[PDB]
A = this chain, B = another copy of it.
Amino acid sequence: SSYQIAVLAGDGIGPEVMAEARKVLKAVEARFGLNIEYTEYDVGGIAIDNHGCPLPEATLKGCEAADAILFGSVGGPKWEKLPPNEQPERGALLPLRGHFELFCNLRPAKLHDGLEHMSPLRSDISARGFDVLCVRELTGGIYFGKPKGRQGEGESEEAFDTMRYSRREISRIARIAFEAARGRRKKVTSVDKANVLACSVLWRQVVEEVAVDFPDVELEHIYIDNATMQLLRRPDEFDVMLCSNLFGDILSDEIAMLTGSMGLLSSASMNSTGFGLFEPAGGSAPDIAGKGIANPIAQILSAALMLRHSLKQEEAASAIERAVTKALNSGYLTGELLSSDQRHKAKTTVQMGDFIADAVKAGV
């Protein structure tokens, strides 16, 4: 009836950009007639400080009661001193994905008109633009495969991780990729290492089995090392890229960096009911936190992805997207999007949130 959203702002700039996303959602709630209730829970570094662990039981139970999780960012210097297997990022994210079976990660990345110059690519490559959606399988492969651990002592002590995938796991994430490519430029590029990995031989086989249901979509396969190179030369020739868990982690981040604009990038991680966790692509930026400098666009577009995919409110989702476009093309830019001779034109976190919420209210 009423929608229930668990709000997990986390660490660093999380809370200050989350405030702007809630301001924009308030404008959307009024314009479209939606009744949404929000509960806040601690997660990450702040949860370690307040509760002794990065994902408290009360937080986990709170997400169980919600229709979606609007997530900020976790991690920072303070806890970067604990062993990597106890740090807040992995400690919050891996159990949330496992617990809610969030097998599908979508990370849309594009070069926005007029910001091509921020990409680290040579200017004649970035002038061509790109628009790539990465679909990454998030609950299988080597992240959760067993056995995992270590045995032995001294020189012969060894550690082991198992990459495992079943046909059922590959076909469900491949179907999402093909369905997405239909709505875009009808091309899926599947990324694997089938010259070495048994998992990748199965991957490429099952992706070709799925392809028969999508005769209008072009399928190509590429090895992961070749993909990491080709994205530097012709990123405009990719449309949907479909990846297993580890290869998707690497490639989605490489493509995010090639935009030069990580403050604009959001991520959705969903299960088959469309419950999901929506978060900015970038990190907690603890050096700028509490200064009003942080770009809230990524957190605001996370809330748009959440309205579309979890709450099936397409019109509300696109109203936010258009309000963001209006900001970007009316010169409302934060400091990290400006060449530093432009730096004095930078808008603060709050001016961005006010502008975008006002544009939604105004009927954009």
Contact = CB atoms under 8 A, between A and B. Distances in A.
Interface of A: 83-85, 87, 89-90, 94, 119-123, 125-126, 142-143, 145, 148-150, 152, 154-168, 171, 193-204, 224-226, 228-229, 232-233, 246, 249-250, 253-254, 256-258
Contact of A123 (B87, B119, B123, B233): B123
A202 B159 contact: yes
A159 B149 contact: no
25 contacts: A83-B201, A84-B194, A84-B195, A84-B200, A85-B201, A87-B195, A94-B196, A120-B122, A120-B125, A120-B232, A121-B121, A121-B122, A122-B122, A143-B196, A149-B198, A157-B202, A158-B165, A158-B202, A161-B162, A163-B163, A224-B249, A228-B254, A228-B257, A229-B254, A232-B254
Given A90-B196, A125-B120, A225-B249, A162 B160 contact: yes
A166 B246 CA distance: 21
Nearest to A119: B122
A204 B16 CA distance: 34
A119 B246 CA distance: 27
B167 A198 contact: no
